[PDB]
């Protein structure tokens, strides 16, 4: 269904923020389409009842205080899609504040 298509297109649109994908020189549409699959293969319901995963990956890629996460995608998508704290442990300043 198009539900997966639009939300992984939005994942690709999140990966490109700040031209970091171009500074690194990587193709982000493949990455977004793979990230949505990595999420779905764990949250395996058709309507993605827990699409908090996708919404949060989108936003956290767009989080300007943790651009290093946007840079990393070298931790592959298969790991990113599952991360607790929505992967913002990599921010390492919010992580220290929470600690």
């Amino acid at each position: 269904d198009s539900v997966r298509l639009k939300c992984r297109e939005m994942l690709a649109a999140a990966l490109r923020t700040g031209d970091d994908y171009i500074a690194i020189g990587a193709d982000e549409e493949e990455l977004g389409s793979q990230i949505e699959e990595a999420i779905y293969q764990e949250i395996r319901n058709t309507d993605m009842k827990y699409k908090n995963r996708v919404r949060s990956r989108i936003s956290n890629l767009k989080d300007a205080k943790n651009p290093n996460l946007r840079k990393n995608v070298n931790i592959p998508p298969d790991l990113f899609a599952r991360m607790t704290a929505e992967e913002m442990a990599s921010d390492e300043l919010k992580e220290m504040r929470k600690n």
Binding site: N52, N60, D63, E86, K94
Partner: protein, 101 residues
């Protein structure tokens, strides 16, 4: 025993008829994430908004998350009560509760 009162910083009720131009500037950029790909129809979100902003100390002190709070509130009242919340990685822990039409 930890109720919504212990983790909340402040609460406010607003007439916020359009989240894509929400009355709170602090929330507009993160509300856009929830409204640029809405998982709900703009016609069922009531324009009346109850904003609850949480203390990161009282949330992190006990590892609480925006997801838990929204899930809990949706269960305590129900279909008549929509809940939106800021991302756990964002700077401000904010909840945006709206009556569902």
């Amino acid at each position: 025993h930890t109720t919504l009162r212990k983790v909340t910083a402040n609460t406010a009720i607003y007439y916020d008829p359009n989240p894509q131009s929400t009355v709170v500037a602090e929330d507009q950029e993160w509300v856009n994430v929830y409204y640029e790909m809405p998982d709900f129809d703009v016609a069922r979100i009531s324009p009346w908004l109850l904003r609850v902003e949480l203390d990161r100390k009282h949330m992190t002190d006990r590892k609480l998350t925006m997801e838990q709070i929204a899930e809990k509130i949706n269960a305590g009242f129900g279909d008549d009560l929509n809940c939106i919340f800021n991302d756990d990685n964002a700077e401000k822990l904010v909840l945006r509760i709206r009556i569902m039409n």
